[PDB]
Structures are given as C-alpha cells and as structure tokens.
Design an enzyme around this catalytic site. Structure first.
Site, PDB file in Angstrom:
ATOM      1  CG  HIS A 145       7.078   5.653   0.693  1.00 42.83           C
ATOM      2  ND1 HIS A 145       6.684   6.781   1.379  1.00 42.83           N
ATOM      3  CD2 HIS A 145       7.088   4.647   1.597  1.00 42.83           C
ATOM      4  CE1 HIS A 145       6.473   6.472   2.646  1.00 42.83           C
ATOM      5  NE2 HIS A 145       6.710   5.184   2.804  1.00 42.83           N
TER       6      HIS A 145
ATOM      7  CG  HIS B 146      -0.211   0.167   2.516  1.00 43.64           C
ATOM      8  ND1 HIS B 146       0.251  -0.907   3.249  1.00 43.64           N
ATOM      9  CD2 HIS B 146       0.136   1.274   3.215  1.00 43.64           C
ATOM     10  CE1 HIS B 146       0.845  -0.467   4.343  1.00 43.64           C
ATOM     11  NE2 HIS B 146       0.791   0.852   4.347  1.00 43.64           N
TER      12      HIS B 146
END
Ligand code: CL
Ligand code: CL
Length: 210
Positions: free
Chosen positions: A143, A64
C-alpha cells in the site's frame, strides 16, 4: 547497520500525482450522499466532516510503498531480508507501481498497490504474519499511506487494507460513482474506490534512514 525500512519511493512527479488524487478522493467522499449517511459508523462523535482535515497526519515529503520495516536491525527478520540476493540486486533500481484503488477507514486513508511478480520477490516473508494476511495472496498488504488520524500509526494502513480485502473476498453492488471509478461501502467506516483505470507510478527501491 540496516535502514529504518526498505521500500519503493515514488519520484516527485509521481508522488504529487498520487497525493492530489488522494485529496480529491477525500473531498469527493466526504461530500457523497452515502458517506454522510454512515457518519454514525465512521465517527462516534458528539455538521459535515472534512476528511482532508480528519486525516491530518500526512507523509511530509514523497510518498512510498513499504516492503520491510527493519528499524536498523531491531525488527524480527530484518537481517534475513536485507541479505537476499534480489534485495541487493534491486537496490536503487527503477520500478512501476500499479495502484488499483483508494481506501478510507476511521483510522487511515491509503492506496492499494498491486505488485508484479518481479516486485513480489522483494516482499518479505518474515514468520510473524498478520492474521488478516491469511487466505489472501502474498503482497496483498502492499500500500501507499496517504493520511492517518491523530492517534494512528502509519503501520495501521496495511492492517486496514488486509482487513478490507478479507471483506471483498465476493461482494455486491457499488453505492456510488466517482469520476475515477466505482465507490463501495464495506461498512464500519470502510470505503473503497475501485479505479476504472489503474494508476501507474514510477518509484525507486532503496533504504531509508532516520
Ligand atoms: Cl508529494
Ligand atoms: Cl501481504
């Protein structure tokens, strides 16, 4: 109350695609001539270091990309974030995340996410900004965490990315060629694999609870 954190959670297929690309990167990097040379800068230990084992702490399930850590409202700006119209409208909505690179440091291993303008609307603007996020455009911190060292917190991955993107801000030649792209040595155990073709992963924006 609020979720532990909001973010884009990759589908099962997407996560396994990005995950396996991350393993290959660690294996390839740990084998590369340039990395074995700079082991002294990556590790002040003590003869080949298995990076896949080094970053032993990996996400257990689906990967995620975090937007805003809320800690059930205990985080600063958490309440203010969850009540945005775009956040409420984007909840449960499908998105494509653009991965531009994979990066490694003595603390974390992750993947850089290049957010679209639509997705940048979901990125938080809480006042307490990391000082490494300055001089860089918003959302640069975006990220996907692939792995961490034993005593490292996943929060560090973003900080490492921002620290890396300050260095690139530009740069010189690449020190090697991997099948997916060019490898760069930014010093101090920092490495960035710039993908020739940017990966696209499907993810759903939502809230995760403990
Ligand atoms: Cl996975
Ligand atoms: Cl940012």
């Amino acid at each position: 109350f609020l979720p532990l954190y909001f973010g884009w959670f990759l589908t099962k297929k997407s996560s396994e695609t990005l995950r396996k690309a991350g393993q290959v990167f660690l294996e390839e990097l740990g084998n590369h001539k340039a990395f074995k040379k700079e082991l002294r800068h990556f590790i002040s230990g003590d003869e080949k270091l298995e990076l896949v084992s080094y970053f032993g702490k990996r996400p257990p399930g689906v990967l995620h990309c975090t937007t805003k850590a809320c800690d059930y409202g205990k985080a600063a700006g958490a309440e203010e974030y969850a009540q945005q119209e775009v956040v409420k409208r984007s909840y449960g909505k499908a998105f494509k995340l653009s991965i531009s690179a994979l990066f490694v440091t003595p603390k974390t291993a992750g993947a850089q996410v290049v957010l679209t303008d639509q997705e940048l609307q979901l990125w938080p603007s809480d006042l307490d900004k990391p000082s490494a996020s300055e001089g860089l455009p918003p959302g640069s911190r975006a990220h996907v965490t692939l792995g961490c060292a034993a005593d490292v917190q996943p929060v560090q991955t973003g900080l490492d990315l921002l620290d890396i993107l300050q260095q690139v801000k530009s740069q010189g030649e690449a020190v090697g060629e991997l099948p997916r792209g060019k490898l760069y040595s930014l010093g101090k155990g920092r490495w960035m694999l710039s993908l020739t073709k940017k990966m696209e992963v499907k993810a759903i924006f939502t809230g995760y609870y403990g």
